[PDB]
Amino acid sequence: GTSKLKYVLQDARFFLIKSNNHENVSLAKAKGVWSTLPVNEKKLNLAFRSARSVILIFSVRESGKFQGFARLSSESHHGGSPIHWVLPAGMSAKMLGGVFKIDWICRRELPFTKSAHLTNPWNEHKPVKIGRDGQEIELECGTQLCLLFPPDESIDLYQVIHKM
Numbered sequence: 001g002t003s004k005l006k007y008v009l010q011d012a013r014f015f016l017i018k019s020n021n022h023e024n025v026s027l028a029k030a031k032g033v034w035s036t037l038p039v040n041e042k043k044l045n046l047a048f049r050s051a052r053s054v055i056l057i058f059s060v061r062e063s064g065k066f067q068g069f070a071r072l073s074s075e076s077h078h079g080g081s082p083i084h085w086v087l088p089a090g091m092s093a094k095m096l097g098g099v100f101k102i103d104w105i106c107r108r109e110l111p112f113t114k115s116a117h118l119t120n121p122w123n124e125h126k127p128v129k130i131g132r133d134g135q136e137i138e139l140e141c142g143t144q145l146c147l148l149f150p151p152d153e154s155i156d157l158y159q160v161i162h163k164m
């Protein structure tokens with residue numbers, strides 16, 4: 001059922017995360033971490049302190065799909081165990097700033113063909129698939145998008161619900 005997921009999402013902010021390759025999403029799915037550029041890092045840290053849950057919805061560029069969604073379990077932090085992302089051309093490890101710890105809620109894919117009926121009012125009422133990295137998604141739109149994902153049998157929401 002959806003009672004657990006709806007509880008997690010009740011007071012949530014949602015952000016579209018765009019990745020340049022599948023490798024970084026695979027790393028993030030296994031280690032439960034994410035890093036972003038400083039402008040988005042500041043936005044996510046503000047959101048973490050202002051909402052009961054902050055949800056990141058991942059899409060690899062040119063893939064035509066979302067690859068899953070996760071909930072922030074911490075603000076960004078520096079000086080921890082270094083994450084060996086595949087750094088894009090001209091980007092250094094210091095430019096990515098802090099590491100967010102995240103708990104994945106769904107690691108299964110959702111093709112854009114299944115979200116074509118959803119528009120984001122906070123992005124000029126464009127289809128929810130459209131947005132720059134870090135684009136915030138309005139609550140109702142983000143909730144309905146997350147509810148479209150298939151159930152993930154590798155996920156147990158027990159830990160997320162306990163840390164809320």
